[model samples]
Target: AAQTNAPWGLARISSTSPGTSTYYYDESAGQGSCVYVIDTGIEASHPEFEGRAQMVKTYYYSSRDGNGHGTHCAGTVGSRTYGVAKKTQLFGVKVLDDNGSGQYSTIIAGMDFVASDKNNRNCPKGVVASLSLGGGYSSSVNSAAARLQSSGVMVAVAAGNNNADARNYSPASEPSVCTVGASDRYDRRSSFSNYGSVLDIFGPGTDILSTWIGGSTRSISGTSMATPHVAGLAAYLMTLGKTTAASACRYIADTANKGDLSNIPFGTVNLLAYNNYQA
Candidate 1:
């Protein structure tokens, strides 16, 4: 399943592109952290995923996944080095069925489980929560999203891939979450990427390579891929909690590097202050 044109390869790169070693993750050092990945059931047995990809808890809202979209997403978020953040733990929640569709209520049900699950509490401090899937925003959605933040959980969501001029959709458009947009090797917004003022940051999502089921690898595209890069970075910054999200983001913005891209207008961040003074 691995594709040939996997956007950018692993390199020292810049702040906006995935780095050789994520600012937060050191493959050699191995920071044992955990995160909640609310997506379809993950292929917990992939080779690249051998020692990584743990399911602290699971909530099945769907019965099937003929499309394999969630599986692809799981690989990008927590499937070893195939993903941006490999050392961290993952709590997979299957909200979408085999059809690649899910109801908001079902998705929220999974979110509730993560916020209250004893396993979530066992994760390292300042744990990050990632939501690459979502629809529209509502008080109900915000209420559910607030449960995590109010409880000290940081969340990252994907700005839809609608390629619209205006920021749209739930969770992503919601102010409570870090909204991620997609960029290519050139740092230009992907033509397919949804861009707007709502975008909190951007990440390399074009023709990106990641993991697949059955110990296989592959490539895919979407804001979903972009969302996890920020999620992993945020989890690292959260480890440095003394700083605020704004400060941490500023650090990235100022020190920005991603090949030829300079003066990078934004970073793949939402919590800059928290990361700056982070422990």
Candidate 2:
């Protein structure tokens, strides 16, 4: 009953198998879930992202993925092999530019679009926003994130890559969003990960391999990577009919691998994320 060919991050949270896992190859992995990856644009035409991916650029950047970061994070959220919710309908909301820089107003605008857009009307169950970007604190963006959460959308944000306390950053420091931190393959917090009570949980983020631009797969590390893992899981839970943000957050936080981080700081020593499928 060993899990094989799975990514270390996914396996660390969902399976008990050892060694690096390849691809899941299951096309219909997570049914009835929609996840919006708000990052650099995604390469919807990329072979690895052939299905279940849609692109909507914010005019703040190129419609294409010049940075490849968004596509990689999108892959981890829903591509058949690299994603968490394999069958999820993934949407790309290009908020950052090629250099991975953007204003908080732009990010908030993207959030506003996702939360009220008629295009997402079909997903009445709700949508999950995966944000892997951050900077100095922004009260405006934080308020928008909270509004989205109150409206039933699950918003997952990076806890910043800086090793400093997460509370010092925007969006991540915000109260209503699920602030995520990075964990290594060994289930320990990554050295560059921002921590503290602001982080809702930890996910595999170090040296992780996933879909990139040009239809290739590459490895990158950051709390940015960890945010999508939770976004994917949130989408998966939504597919199971866990519609509200509160319920899914409760289940995710309650079922996380508490013992794995039992010796960490900010009472987060027990906040390692875990993924389990129960229908």
Candidate 3:
């Protein structure tokens, strides 16, 4: 899948426009889906996401992105530029505070909010939960993720940046979740990315450019950046009637470009998260 007209990352995952030179993926410009970014927060007013993102839920009293991490992840998921699902409604569920730290309970609370039907009362049919934060393994959080998946919400999480076995992590080790590892622009696993059995796939995370706090954009690296890419892919796949998390995951895993990362040894290249998906 050597798509000449688009970015290598997007093209590898089959998320690009088919017949045109445009970078947009026409089948699902993120229109009929919603991706809830459960992290520090999101700068809803960021120009790249002027009318695209909103503060839907928050465990942190305030609903603004102070750490810049969440905003960056949000932009990667849905901003017009550097986004996978450019038009999807982005919701911020601020589990982390300005310091980029939060308790396991806080994270679980955010997941609960998104999983509840009330959260989707006015939202789209396709829902995705994108979490770029990680910590020690928490069974409660893992159970919450499982519940979300069973309830028809797609869940994507970041494999910890510790460079250790991802199986030692919580949400990343959660079986029902789509745990993502960081891969560079050259399709090599980031030195800091956790690998091993827990990771479900890989995505562009090295020097990724996305929205930031105070309406700015910057390039950062981490498994956090990779998580949103897969989350956006899951959201886009949902729009194509892959409503269940299992179905969406299957479509992604089955069509992934495994040949590109054949030399990587930590984990299997189940799905590379390209922009080639079609309607």
Q: List the candidates' TM-scores in order.
A: 0.76, 0.91, 0.89
Best by TM-score: 2
Report each candidate's C-alpha RMSD, comma-separated, in the order given: 5.7, 2.6, 3.5
Error of 3 at 158 (Å): 0.6
Best-to-worst order by lDDT is 2, 3, 1
* CA deviation > 4 Å runs, candidate 3: 1-12, 15-24, 117-119, 277-279
User: Each prediction's Cα lDDT score?
Assistant: 0.57, 0.78, 0.77
lDDT of 3 by residue, 1-279 (tens): 122454334544554222233343664566778888999888987788859888887776688777999999998898876677877888889999999999998888888888894355444657888989989887887898888877777889999899788877878889888889888766677889888876678887787778889888888999999899899988776776655565676667666666565336634554476645444
- lDDT of candidate 2? 0.78
Off by over 4 Å in 1: 1-30, 56-67, 118-121, 239-279
Ranking by TM-score: 2, 3, 1
Better of 1 and 3 by TM-score: 3
* Tens-place lDDT digits, model 2, residues 9-128: 877767433245533323335567678899997888876666678886565625787899999999999876688887778888898998888888888898888877625445645578
